[PDB]
Amino acid sequence: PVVRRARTSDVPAIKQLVDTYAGKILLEKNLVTLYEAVQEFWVAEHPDLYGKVVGCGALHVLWSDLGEIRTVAVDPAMTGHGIGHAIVDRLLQVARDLQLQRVFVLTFETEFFARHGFTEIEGTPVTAEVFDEMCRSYDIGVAEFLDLSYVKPNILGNSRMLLVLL
Template identity: 30%
Template sequence: MDTKDFYIRKARVQDVETIHKSIMVCAKDGLMLPRAFTDLYSHMRDHYVIAPREGQGPIKGCCALSLCWKDYAEVRSLMVDEDMRGRGWGKRLVEACLSEALTLGFYKVFTLTYQVDFFHSLGFEEVDKNELPQKVWSDCIHCAKFPNCDETAMLIEL
């Protein structure tokens, strides 16, 4: 599969089922936490996807920028299909989110991740989850893993 046959664009409603299926596969493999359909539909505009240029075939990855509070935004739900990994698509998806964060005036972007080395390579640094109290009390408190979260909190200041 040639990478020039794909590009990054904002998600569309017809992408949500594929995004959900892909996230659930990654969640089953322990790479990320699952997301509900209702969450994906209500936050569809947050997502970028790797889409085929000719419009034929499914999307091959996604990443979302969630606006949290004041000057904080979150990169979440990063997923790249196995056959597209190692080609820079994950980096491009995160960069699209970071660019949007800057455009909107959000200069602190965090993530909760199992992929620490990947996010380190993009300039994110590990932080204590206590630095993200709004995230913990708005989202994390509803997670099945709370209060024993095993994800690593990371932050980049733009």
């Protein structure tokens, strides 16, 4: 499973992957937001059809020592082949290369992420001072990490998970 940095030509395929699960499962992403985020997105290619994109994932930095895995989606016709886990592996190595100590994820796929050492947590693990700084973010994923009131209706039932990197 080859995982590589996304290119702008991958964005339509990424968009189709997100829309497949957008709603309760994945937070929506419109096209412009995906172009804007292309330098943090990664894609998995089909093993035998060169250059076809069957999965995507992004690592989003939240603070100096904290990152989040987000927008991990695998083509439903290509699941169960190691693609999801390979994307998470590469995204975690990005977090390491960026010298992050902790990675967050908000998800229903509790056991999938438990394979990588993520454990369920309660609350929001940042100081009160960092919490107030992060509230000025415009990114809705950040508000979901912060558990802000106006996104509470959209995330009910998700598990909050954290991985401390070695």
